[PDB]
Scaffold this active site. Structure first.
Site, PDB file in Angstrom:
ATOM      1  N   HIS B  41      26.921  47.449  48.239  1.00 41.50           N
ATOM      2  CA  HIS B  41      27.384  48.614  47.456  1.00 41.50           C
ATOM      3  C   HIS B  41      27.408  48.360  45.946  1.00 41.50           C
ATOM      4  CE1 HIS B  41      31.707  47.170  47.399  1.00 41.50           C
ATOM      5  NE2 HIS B  41      31.660  47.803  46.239  1.00 41.50           N
ATOM      6  N   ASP B 182      46.190  42.408  47.316  1.00 42.01           N
ATOM      7  CA  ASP B 182      44.904  42.920  47.792  1.00 42.01           C
ATOM      8  C   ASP B 182      43.794  42.445  46.853  1.00 42.01           C
ATOM      9  OD1 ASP B 182      43.102  44.349  49.430  1.00 42.01           O
ATOM     10  OD2 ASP B 182      43.773  46.329  48.739  1.00 42.01           O
ATOM     11  N   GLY B 186      36.673  45.555  41.249  1.00 45.82           N
ATOM     12  CA  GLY B 186      35.820  44.610  40.529  1.00 45.82           C
ATOM     13  C   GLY B 186      35.611  43.261  41.198  1.00 45.82           C
ATOM     14  N   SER B 188      34.589  43.177  44.359  1.00 46.53           N
ATOM     15  CA  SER B 188      33.542  43.458  45.344  1.00 46.53           C
ATOM     16  C   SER B 188      32.433  42.411  45.312  1.00 46.53           C
ATOM     17  CB  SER B 188      32.910  44.835  45.104  1.00 46.53           C
ATOM     18  OG  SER B 188      33.813  45.889  45.396  1.00 46.53           O
TER      19      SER B 188
HETATM   20  C1  LIG Z   1      31.720  50.278  50.162  1.00 53.33           C
HETATM   21  O1  LIG Z   1      32.733  50.063  49.173  1.00 53.33           O
HETATM   22  C2  LIG Z   1      32.967  51.170  48.287  1.00 53.33           C
HETATM   23  C3  LIG Z   1      33.909  50.708  47.208  1.00 53.33           C
HETATM   24  O2  LIG Z   1      34.184  51.443  46.272  1.00 53.33           O
HETATM   25  N1  LIG Z   1      34.409  49.456  47.291  1.00 53.33           N
HETATM   26  C4  LIG Z   1      35.293  48.890  46.271  1.00 53.33           C
HETATM   27  C5  LIG Z   1      36.562  48.292  46.821  1.00 53.33           C
HETATM   28  C6  LIG Z   1      36.730  46.930  47.036  1.00 53.33           C
HETATM   29  C7  LIG Z   1      37.940  46.437  47.526  1.00 53.33           C
HETATM   30  C8  LIG Z   1      38.973  47.317  47.802  1.00 53.33           C
HETATM   31  C9  LIG Z   1      40.318  46.854  48.329  1.00 53.33           C
HETATM   32  N2  LIG Z   1      40.271  45.634  49.151  1.00 53.33           N
HETATM   33  C10 LIG Z   1      38.798  48.672  47.574  1.00 53.33           C
HETATM   34  C11 LIG Z   1      37.599  49.156  47.082  1.00 53.33           C
HETATM   35  O3  LIG Z   1      37.397  50.476  46.859  1.00 53.33           O
HETATM   36  C12 LIG Z   1      38.541  51.295  47.104  1.00 53.33           C
HETATM   37  C13 LIG Z   1      38.199  52.705  46.723  1.00 53.33           C
HETATM   38  N3  LIG Z   1      36.961  52.982  46.261  1.00 53.33           N
HETATM   39  O4  LIG Z   1      39.045  53.580  46.832  1.00 53.33           O
HETATM   40  C14 LIG Z   1      33.490  52.328  49.095  1.00 53.33           C
HETATM   41  C15 LIG Z   1      32.581  53.256  49.579  1.00 53.33           C
HETATM   42  C16 LIG Z   1      33.024  54.321  50.340  1.00 53.33           C
HETATM   43  C17 LIG Z   1      34.371  54.446  50.629  1.00 53.33           C
HETATM   44  O5  LIG Z   1      34.813  55.493  51.387  1.00 53.33           O
HETATM   45  C18 LIG Z   1      35.275  53.514  50.149  1.00 53.33           C
HETATM   46  C19 LIG Z   1      34.837  52.447  49.383  1.00 53.33           C
END
Ligand SMILES: CO[C@H](C(=O)NCc1ccc(CN)cc1OCC(N)=O)c1ccc(O)cc1
Ligand SMILES: [Ca+2]
Lengths: 57, 250
Positions: B41, B182, B186, B188
């Site tokens: 992603h 958690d 950033g 990721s």
């Molecule tokens: C596939 O990942 C993305 C994304 O944005 N990841 C970033 C991330 C990393 C770690 C954490 C918490 N451990 C939370 C995060 O995002 C939280 C958020 N975006 O609210 C995604 C896509 C679709 C979806 O429905 C939700 C997330």
């Protein structure tokens, strides 16, 4: 011994073989000791070890 | 990382920082001298694939101390099953243009065998997650590398304890539901690293969740054990022209 229980006694990787046999293996950068379970580094920077802490001890 | 601590310099030596046009994009994990594992992603909005840089040996973003090693990213390999903008199959394998040099500050994390990871590592309760991500939800990112110890949950338990994407067989939950601790946006792509008998192994990739440290929700991580054979096959392959490569999965 079997690999699903206690990792077959292996420090790292474990293979089951036909008939109450087990072989342990080690990642690249490590060699298996004569105990058949322990792995010792063969290089300066083996994976998964932290030099400043390894030196610390 | 929310609710962690500074990772003392050199104690997270496999951590990678990914930059696009000099700006922080994501984390990653070094698994040998030319290969880095990250999250698919992270690459959804990349326009110029040729301005991606990986940095090893990084710690403090405000200063250069000489331990940093920067490399161009020559290949970004993503599974065929990943769909941009969604959560499942969130893994990327990156080939560096030139190997990094291993040092006290740059060391790969072990990519475990699948059987070992499923039979043994999956039952180690606590693991470390790290990165230069947000220190708070809706907050500024970290200037020093941060690290956090998180406990892993069986998915049935995660669903029962949580209170909206599915948690698939290619994911696992880890962390806390009280809003204190958690990984975040950033972070990721960064490592979820698991210790077993004196050695650390790659078990997860910081992937997603509902915000960061949201009460009633856990962090969700890519279950790396599902991808070991996919990764190993690709690492034996010759490079192909063009940075992005979609590779069949399984
Ligand atoms: C596939 O990942 C993305 C994304 O944005 N990841 C970033 C991330 C990393 C770690 C954490 C918490 N451990 C939370 C995060 O995002 C939280 C958020 N975006 O609210 C995604 C896509 C679709 C979806 O429905 C939700 C997330
Ligand atoms: Ca620095």
């Amino acid at each position: 011994l079997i690999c699903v229980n206690e990792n077959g006694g292996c420090e790292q990787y474990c293979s089951d073989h036909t008939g109450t046999k087990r072989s342990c293996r080690c990642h690249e950068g490590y060699s298996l000791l004569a105990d058949g379970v322990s792995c010792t580094p063969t290089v300066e920077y083996p994976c998964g070890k932290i030099p400043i802490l390894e030196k610390r001890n | 990382i929310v609710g962690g601590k500074v990772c003392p310099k050199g104690e997270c030596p496999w951590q990678v920082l990914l930059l696009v046009n000099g700006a922080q994009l994501c984390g990653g994990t070094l698994i040998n001298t030319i290969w880095v594992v990250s999250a698919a992603h992270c690459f959804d909005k990349i326009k110029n694939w040729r301005n991606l840089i990986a940095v090893l040996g990084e710690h403090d973003l405000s200063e250069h101390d000489g331990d940093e090693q920067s490399r161009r990213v020559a290949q970004v390999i993503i599974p065929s099953t990943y769909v941009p903008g969604t959560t499942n199959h969130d893994i990327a394998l990156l080939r560096l243009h030139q190997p990094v040099v291993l040092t006290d500050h740059v060391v790969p994390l072990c990519l475990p065998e699948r059987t070992f990871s499923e039979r043994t590592l999956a039952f180690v309760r606590f693991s470390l997650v790290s990165g230069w991500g947000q220190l708070l939800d809706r907050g500024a990112t970290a200037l020093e590398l941060m690290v956090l110890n998180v406990p892993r949950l069986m998915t049935q338990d995660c669903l029962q304890q949580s209170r909206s994407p599915n948690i698939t067989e290619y994911m696992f939950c880890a962390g806390y539901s009280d809003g204190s601790k958690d990984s975040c946006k950033g972070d990721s792509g960064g490592p979820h690293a698991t210790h077993y008998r004196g050695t650390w192994y790659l078990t997860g990739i910081v992937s997603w969740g509902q915000g960061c440290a949201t009460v009633g929700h856990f962090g969700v991580y890519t279950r790396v054990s599902q991808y070991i054979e996919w990764l190993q096959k690709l690492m034996r392959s010759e490079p192909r022209p063009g940075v992005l490569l979609r590779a069949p999965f399984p």
